[PDB]
Amino acid sequence: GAVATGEYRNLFAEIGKSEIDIQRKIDEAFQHLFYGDAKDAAVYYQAGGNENGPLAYVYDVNSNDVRSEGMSYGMMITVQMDKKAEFDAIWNWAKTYMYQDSPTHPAFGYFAWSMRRDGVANDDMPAPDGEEYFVTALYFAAARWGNGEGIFNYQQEADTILSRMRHRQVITGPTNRGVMTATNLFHPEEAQVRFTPDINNADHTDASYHLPSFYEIWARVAPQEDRAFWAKAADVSRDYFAKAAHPVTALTPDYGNFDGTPWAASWRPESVDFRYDAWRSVMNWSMDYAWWGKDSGAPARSDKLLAFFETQEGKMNHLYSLDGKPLGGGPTLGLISMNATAAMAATDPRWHNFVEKLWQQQPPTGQYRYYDGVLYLMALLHCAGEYKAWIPD
Ligand code: NA
User: How far apart are CA 392 and CA 233, in angstroms?
Assistant: First the structure.
């Protein structure tokens, strides 16, 4: 695995791109998304400052709301790119405005998934993959930059936040969506991340939230009492992908049950199909394989997914039934980007075409640029060999 060798694959270089052009590709994506035209290109907004220094956020320019996932991806992008100032700015806004610190609030320990730009939460419940990226990005920040104090003691923040994700108790109380009751963020027996800690729908999961590549970091650096749990979670997720991905196409559903079957949410019964969440599943298992080499099924699964998408050339949708029936939409940058990351595990040389397809893209503009853009930039960093495990002491 790349973590053991320290050798991360530069998939763009393997398909013949020069390092100067690769660096320019990443630099342009970053510059557009972080510092581009405010109305058409950027998803990053500099939001003044407080006692911790500058504040900033990544936001969904469509809904005009700050999303915890985007904040956490922003932090991951910025630590990977050695952009401490931007990382610290994003973290400051997340921890200041999004994180619930009241021990009697049902969202205690969690970051609000959807928040208005004035700091008013739309929903105090978390999108758990946000928490997962926050913690991991914080450990990586500790490793790259060392720990500061207060909110910038990155390692202490990660440790506390991660411990609470596991050990959170059931709490009931008022929220911006009315009185709610919520629980921990990982099932204590199944060792799987929940789709939601809201007690009314807590016993479900989402394949795109399974991040064994990160659980392996936590198994090494978390509070000692929880390391065996995170190691279990890593193993569980590898089996989960094996069960949850369709055996022919390797498409996963947006939401799922702990046993691997698709789950139809009452408010979104189309969650049983391959849609916006499920685009990311392949990145998760491919990253895990590339880093750790433990998921012996990941190469075949990546190969299956790429073989499926090769059948869609010139008619690619972005919504699919798990057996591969198109359910609408056209190609999206986000899905192109995630498919390219399958090349971190794929063996069949058709992966070259998917990495070339990513190379041919450009930074997104317009109303849907947030989700496309954060996925694009993460995909560029993975495919350039620039998305690494930065394991702290
Ligand atoms: Na608690």
Answer: 20
